[PDB]
C-alpha cells in the first residue's frame, strides 16, 4: 500500500546509507541482527514502509546498494549494519571509474544497470503501491554521480507516476577528492533537475564551516560529517512512520513544498547543534530552538536566510512537548519579520509535532526550509565552472570518453537560468 | 636569374582507397596555397593557409607539353647564342619527378614520346633548321649520365664507371663519358629508350620504377671541325628525399643507397642557402651531384629552370612545406 523502494550509489551514498540505518534502527529501536525489540505500537504498525516481511520478527530491509569498485562494497558489509540486509542485493562492478562521470554514465556505467534495474523490477511487483524512490549520492564524483543519475532516467521512463526525491551532496573546495569537479557537478545537476521532484541540498561547505566554528572540530573526517547528515535524514523521514496532525506523506510533501513548476533545492535546518554524546547543553526547550531554526548559521546548506525570502517553512518537531508554545513562538517571526517569510501562501505549514524522541535527544526539532538563499550555491558553482570552461581547461578527460563538447553549454546555461529565476521578488 | 616553377601532381587511385585529403590549391596562374590542418592547445582544430608566388604554377590537369612550353622551351633560344642551360626536378620521392622528365609512366614501359628530354631534343632540331641558325653549321651530340652511390656511371655504354676531374679554368669535366653524334630526332629517341631501360631502379608494388639515381642527360652543341663546346642543355632528374615512412622491407642494401640519396640532397640544400648569403665558401665539392650542378648556379651564361614537384595529399603536407620553401629560396637569388 505505502511501500518504498530505496536506492543509493557511490562512496558518499554508501558512507551515509550505513549511517542512515543506524539512526533509524535506534529511533525505531530495531535489532541490527535482523530482528526487532521494541515496545510501542507507533513503531510496529508501519513496518511495511521500507521493510519486507518474514516470520520470527525478521525481514529483509530492501535498498539497492551499488558501486563498481569492490572496496566500498566490502566496507559496508563488516559490522552489524552488514548482515542486516539481503545478500542477493550485492550488486557490484568490475572496474571502478576513477572519479570519471563519463565512464559512470556512458561507457562502463551504462553496462550493469541491467543488473540493477532487474532488482528494481522484482522489488516493485512484490509491493502493491510504490510511493517513491529515494536516492543518496554525491553531486561531484564518479559512479555516485554517473550511475546514480542514470538510474533515475531508467526508472522515470518506466515508472513515471512515482514521486522521486534525492538526498543531494554538493561538493566543496575545503573537503575535496579529485580536486577539480565543477565538471562533475553541473553535469550531475542538469540531469537531476530535469528528472526529479524533491532535492535536499546538503553541502560540505556548510558541514565544515560549522565544525570549524561551532562544534570546534577543526580537522574532521567524512564520518564526522556523516554523523551530522544522518541526523537530519531521520528528522526528514520521521513523517513516514510516525504519523501526526500533519499527515505528511512524500507525495503530500511534494505538493506542499514545490511552488514553482521546476524543483528547487531544499535547505534544511537543525535542532541544538552538537556531536554525539557531548555534554554541556541545556534542556531542549521549545522557545529556544525557534532561534536555532531561523539562525543565519544553523543551516545544512551554506546560504543567506536573512536575504532569501521564504517560500515553504515546514518544520517537523519531535518529542513529547507542549502544543501551545509551538503555535506561539512561530508567531514571533512572521508577525515581526515580513521580509524573511513573504506573501505567497496564506497559512503556510510551520509545524508537525512527533512524540517519539530521537536516540540521544529529547524534544528535538527538524527544520526544512526552501527560499531564494539557494542562489549562492548556484553562483559559487558557476563561477568556479566558468573559470574552468572559458579557457576549455581539463576538457580532454571527457571528449575521448564518448561525450559532447556542447553538452557543457546547456548545463552551464541551465544553472544561470536558475539564478535569474530566483529574483522573483 | 633562375626561373622557378611548381607542379602539383594529381591523386592516384590507391590514395583514394586510403581516403586521402587534398590540401594543395592552385587558384591562379602563379600562386599556390597549402591548407595546413593545425590544432590548438585545447584540441580546437583550425586551418592555416600558406600562400606562395612563383614565376609560374601548374595545376593537376596540366600535361607534360604545357610543363615543357613554360620551362625548357624558352631555354632553347639560349643554347644557340653560346650559353648553357639546365633544368632540375626537385621534390619528394613519389612526387612525379621522373614522370615529368623521363616520360609518362605507361605501366610496364616508358612512353618516352612525352617527357622533357624528347620534347627539347626535338625542338633543338627545328631551331637548327631555321635559316638564321642553319648558317652556323653546328653538330648536335648527346650524352647521358647516372649518379649512383655517389659515383658517376654511364648509360650509353653499359657500366663504364666515370671520374669527375677539373680543368685549369675551373670547369668540371666528367671523363671519359660517351658522346654519340645525333643525326635526327629518330636517333635521339633511340638513346632515351635505351637509356631508361638500363637506369638502376627498385622493384616494389607502390613505385615499381622508383628512381634510385640522379640521371643527367646532356645535349652538346658543337661547331663542325673545331672540337669546342658552343652550347649545352643539361637535364637533371633527381632521386628525391624519401624519409617519411620508408620502412617497408628495407634491408642493408636498400638503405645503403637510401642514406646516400638523402646525403646528396643536403649538399644541394646547403649550396642554395650559401649562395643566398654572400662571400661564403660554396660547398660544391661535398657531393658529386653538387659538383655537376656548379655551372648551373654560378655560370655567367647559365639560365636554369627548377621544376618543384609536389605531392598533393594530407600525409605529405610536411614534405610539401619543406620542398616549397627551398624553391622560394631558389627564386630569391641574385648571383652576379
Ligand atoms: N601529372 C601526373 N599525372 C598523372 N600521373 C602522374 C603525374 N605525375 C606523376 N604521375 C604518376 O605518379 C606515379 C609515380 O610517379 P613518379 O614520376 O615515379 O614519381 P617520382 O617522384 O619520380 N618517384 P621517383 O622516380 O623515385 O622519383 C606514376 O604512376 C606516374 O604515372
Ligand atoms: N560529506 C561527505 N562527502 C563524501 C563522502 N564520501 C565521498 N564524498 C564526496 O564525494 C566525492 C567523491 O565521489 P565518489 O563517491 O568517491 O566517486 P566514485 O566513488 O567514483 O563514484 C568527494 O568530492 C567527496 O567530497 C562522505 O562520506 N561524506
Ligand atoms: Mg623518378
PDB file of N, CA and C in Angstrom, chain A residues 392 395-396, chain B residues 42-44:
ATOM      1  N   UNK A 392      38.603  26.364 -21.716  1.00  0.00           N
ATOM      2  CA  UNK A 392      38.440  24.967 -22.139  1.00  0.00           C
ATOM      3  C   UNK A 392      39.446  24.041 -21.458  1.00  0.00           C
ATOM      4  N   UNK A 395      39.419  19.751 -20.565  1.00  0.00           N
ATOM      5  CA  UNK A 395      38.339  19.318 -21.437  1.00  0.00           C
ATOM      6  C   UNK A 395      38.520  17.888 -21.916  1.00  0.00           C
ATOM      7  N   UNK A 396      39.768  17.435 -22.038  1.00  0.00           N
ATOM      8  CA  UNK A 396      40.075  16.193 -22.734  1.00  0.00           C
ATOM      9  C   UNK A 396      39.827  14.947 -21.900  1.00  0.00           C
TER      10      UNK A 396
ATOM     11  N   UNK B  42      43.879  23.469 -26.750  1.00  0.00           N
ATOM     12  CA  UNK B  42      42.645  22.969 -26.166  1.00  0.00           C
ATOM     13  C   UNK B  42      41.866  22.057 -27.110  1.00  0.00           C
ATOM     14  N   UNK B  43      42.566  21.345 -28.002  1.00  0.00           N
ATOM     15  CA  UNK B  43      42.007  20.432 -29.003  1.00  0.00           C
ATOM     16  C   UNK B  43      40.983  21.097 -29.920  1.00  0.00           C
ATOM     17  N   UNK B  44      41.118  22.396 -30.163  1.00  0.00           N
ATOM     18  CA  UNK B  44      40.262  23.092 -31.120  1.00  0.00           C
ATOM     19  C   UNK B  44      41.037  23.204 -32.420  1.00  0.00           C
TER      20      UNK B  44
END
